[PDB]
Amino acid sequence: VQLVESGGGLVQPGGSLRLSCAASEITVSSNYMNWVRQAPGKGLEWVSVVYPGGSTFYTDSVKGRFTISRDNSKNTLYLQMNSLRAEDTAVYYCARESGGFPLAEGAFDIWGQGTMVTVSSASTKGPSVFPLAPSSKSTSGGTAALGCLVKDYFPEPVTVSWNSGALTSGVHTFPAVLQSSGLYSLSSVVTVPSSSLGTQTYICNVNHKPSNTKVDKRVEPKSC
Amino acid sequence: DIQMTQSPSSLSASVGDRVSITCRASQSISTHLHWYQQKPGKAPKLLISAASTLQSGVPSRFSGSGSGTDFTLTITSLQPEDFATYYCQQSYSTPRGLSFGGGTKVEIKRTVAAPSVFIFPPSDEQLKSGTASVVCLLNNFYPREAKVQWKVDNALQSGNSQESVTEQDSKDSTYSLSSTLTLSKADYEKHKVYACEVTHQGLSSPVTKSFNRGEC
Amino acid sequence: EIVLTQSPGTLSLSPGERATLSCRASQSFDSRYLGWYQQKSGQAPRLLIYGASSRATGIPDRFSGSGSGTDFTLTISRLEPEDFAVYYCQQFGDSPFTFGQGTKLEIKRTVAAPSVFIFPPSDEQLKSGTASVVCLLNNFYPREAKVQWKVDNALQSGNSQESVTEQDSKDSTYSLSSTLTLSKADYEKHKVYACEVTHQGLSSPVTKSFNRGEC
Amino acid sequence: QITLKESGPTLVKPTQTLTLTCTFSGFSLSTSGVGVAWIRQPPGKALEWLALIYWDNDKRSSPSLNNRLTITKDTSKNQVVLTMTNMDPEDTATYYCAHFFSHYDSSNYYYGSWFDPWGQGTLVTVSSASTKGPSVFPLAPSSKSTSGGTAALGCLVKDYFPEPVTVSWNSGALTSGVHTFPAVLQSSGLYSLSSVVTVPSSSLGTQTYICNVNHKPSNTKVDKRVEPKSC
Amino acid sequence: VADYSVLYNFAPFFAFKCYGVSPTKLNDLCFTNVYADSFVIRGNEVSQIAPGQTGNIADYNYKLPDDFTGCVIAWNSNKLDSKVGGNYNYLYRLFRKSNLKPFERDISTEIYQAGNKPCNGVAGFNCYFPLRSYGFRPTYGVGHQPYRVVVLSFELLHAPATVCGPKKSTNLVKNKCVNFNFNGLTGTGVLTESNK
Ligand SMILES: *[C@@H]1O[C@H](CO)[C@@H](O)[C@H](O)[C@H]1NC(C)=O
């Protein structure tokens, strides 16, 4: 059995999109098929269901706005969304209802891998990389920390690596966050001893795939 | 309109400890609630069906019980890769009223780790564009709860700080905290010394970390 | 299955004051499915409270009960010696319908040492081929009292039995009988049979002996 | 006020099947909410319900004993038949049949459900043995002059079946300080008990002690004399 | 003769909804046939019993015609169908392949083969029994408590009508100019004893 998602992506507010969930070992036109909402970092949220017969129900928030469909040509689930708004950024899941060997109803036994759908007009562009050097000190216990701050990029995924991924020890990669401008920002810090501040060389690779941007920045400790 | 509260909201317990979550709904749900397991970054997986029945191929440690308006899910031997989120979902209003509980993240338990706190003033290159980002960094602390106070000329700041926490590390079971203040060029030139004050359970007293633009 | 648990196992309180018992449930279920039942020794159980929150038919206002989820409790305020009975908490939630384990309520008393007496097997029982010696503990409180059998200062085991009679309704006392049954081969290979009682009221062990041959 | 009565063969051999009659009066088995419940109680152990029949001929069996248990009802005769097979000596217990009802008020809110007061019940015992006349043996007081003016004597009952056995002393003229110990089963599938009266050591030489034990199943009315005996 | 006055004398009628025709009208016109359809459902699904409605019971178990004539009488029966330990004798079709035409019966008890793999008597994994049994426990809420429903459907075809409510008769007044209606013969006059 499998429920694979397809058609997700990023769209401006007020747009239209189609989601297709291909099903294997289970019949869309004979089972209880549910479209579920899940925000990044938040909890779940059921949206819509289609009964085996063909009758459909929608959650109160999106009543009159989503269109759920069953496709016998490819035993797939279709979802039509229009007039997209800023709250429509989340992962959608195609789930099977009334599943499980003991035959217990009310349950989402089988969950799809889920697809991203992000609705914003952030005008996808490149990043902005800023070094953060360790504070001017002698040793401070042999513990210095440097890092790269990525600011004003859109959209995810972005990748930050140290020394082509060879410098991973003691590396904290803060998950990205959203500002009021629709852009994104994260921090990536790495700790090295204060003695090693001036001995080894340090590089920082910031790759933005959707905008096709590569940045190499040398983070070098600064004095005062 | 079926509202579920899950207790505890966060349940930190070491491996092999018998843990027990409770879910409470407003109006009676009886047996029409189910327990699912979702990993961070993975789709949910069903664990407890019929509010009492274990699934097929699932370990026998899990046990779903409770009835009326209080429901319980207990894991007798929480093995190391069980640290996920658990959700309680009612099916009483299964036509339209499908709602979920908050969900409890299970986090690996370690000794108290004292964070290291560092100051990152904005680079001059970033100042050249009119944006100044000041970072307070806290590393290797446990538990997750920690407090940062942004002092500008011995005055507290709020409502304009971007705060992020990294997922629990797989080696030292610790956390990572980044607090960011973004200000305009005139605001950055309007003050001299900026500091971040840190309060954590691994620190007996809150610690100040300060820096001056005139000095550096 | 949902397991119930009465607490404590045996409650000892004098008539007049408030007596309170607890009943806890392994699993959760609604309040209305628990019932408090009352039964006397060798007597049919009688319905005390239905729903565990509303009095049954004809129940005096002294009886009361309250609880939620998996923890209920029952209380009797003005209890009389005849009201001292066994109370059970039983679930109506799901089959099987199981009661409590039974908690005995007894009248408190000053700790009194039991009078201890001996009873050798009679001659007719000796001629029967199997003998039984019985020694009696009388007029003691509480019921528990440790009893030992010995034959020429040898710890006998596995061949003795104990019988306890219900609490006396007059002096709040008890009676215990220790019976040791033997065959002729073991009966006629020693001299003295003794039984030892230890009790709260007895500051020291009390062993009493008798020789079959001399008496 | 409803009358409940239970009947059936009190002596049944092991690994066999027995049938129990329950008769009820004051209510009929054609009313909504009415049920008949069959319950077993081991001697000294916790209560344990077994079976239920509703007014609509729908029956509930205990999941631990539903294999060999049947309960049936007869509204016309106010009759209940409980058939239970494959008894074993441990099934020596007390059997009861009682009423089940529930309470509703103006919305059927179900203000709980209860049992009515139970019937008399029947002490049903299981044993692969033969009826044996009880043997009475005198337990005489030890030879003592005063001993504080306190002494004890009695009669021990052995080798009887089944329970109970009735004991009387001095034709009912001696019931002060008398302990009638409950019956004790020995290791050979056979029972024992005693009846002990406490009398002063100064009352031994003036009062004769006679004990009468009556055992209807064995039809034994045994009178035994207990006298003080000297060493 | 169908006296509907016995309807109101019955239970409180948690739902008593009449479609198209009014309750005060159906005691006047005279139908040719009546169908009384009785069953037991949950309180949540009582609204599902209506012309042109959707839901589990509306789709697969009992579908009213879009021009249904008559009405629905539902009332709680928590006194009867509530049993301790759950009453597991009231079933309903949870799985179905299609939607029933109005006033249709689906009593087939087979394994629902809703997956690619057939069952043919094997109730394993993707092999479900469509009949789920209600709990109807006494402690269940109003939505999940058992409710009895009777749907009355009326047929007024070209065949002669033989089912309709009773007709009242007054006293008998003689030797006075009155207006009379004798079995539909309507006139005015003075009624007198006769020897015809
Ligand atoms: C039968 O139904 C009528 C309806 O009016 C009601 O008056 C009567 O009480 C009912 N009888 C029984 C035995 O329920």
Residue numbers in the entry:
A (entry chain M): 2 to 225
B (entry chain N): 1 to 216
C (entry chain L): 1 to 215
D (entry chain H): 1 to 231
E (entry chain A): 378 to 573
What's in the article?
Omicron variant is characterized by significant mutation in its spike (S) protein, which is a major target of vaccines. In particular, the receptor-binding domain (RBD) of the spike protein has undergone more than 15 amino acid substitutions, altering both the transmissibility and its recognition by the immune system. Two bnAbs, L4.65 and L5.34, showed ultrapotent neutralizing activities (IC50 ≤ 10 ng/mL) against almost all the pseudoviruses tested. L4.65 and L5.34 were mapped to RBD-5 and RBD-2, respectively, the two major antigenic sites of bnAbs elicited by ZF2001.
To explore the molecular basis of their epitopes, we next determined the cryo-EM structures of these two bnAbs in complexed with S-trimer of prototype (resolution 2.65 Å), Omicron BA.2 (resolution 2.75 Å), and BA.4/5 (resolution 2.85 Å), respectively. Notably, an S-trimer bound three pairs of fragments antibody-binding (Fabs) of L4.65 and L5.34 in its open state without steric clash. Three Fab pairs engaged three up RBDs with the same binding mode in different S-timers. L5.34 and L4.65 interact with the inner and outer face of the RBD, respectively. The footprint of L5.34 locates at the typical RBD-2 site towards RBD peak, largely overlapping with the RBM, while the footprint of L4.65 is at the typical RBD-5 site beneath the mesa in the outer face of RBD. The epitopes of L5.34 harbor more mutations in Omicron BA.2 (D405N, K417N, S477N, T478K, E484A, Q493R, N501Y, and Y505H) and BA.4/5 (D405N, K417N, S477N, T478K, E484A, F486V, N501Y, and Y505H), compared with the epitopes of L4.65 (N440K and 498R) in both Omicron sub-variants. This explained the largely decreased binding affinity of L5.34, but not L4.65, to RBD of Omicron BA.2 or BA.4/5, when compared with its binding to prototype RBD. We demonstrate that the binding affinity of RBD-2-directed mAb L5.34 to RBD of Omicron BA.2 or BA.4/5 strains has a huge reduction (1–2 orders of magnitude) compared with that to prototype RBD. However, despite this reduction, the binding affinity (KD of 1.67E−10 M and 4.07E−10 M to bind BA.2 and BA.4/5, respectively) remains relatively high. The high affinity is still effective in efficiently preventing the viral infection.
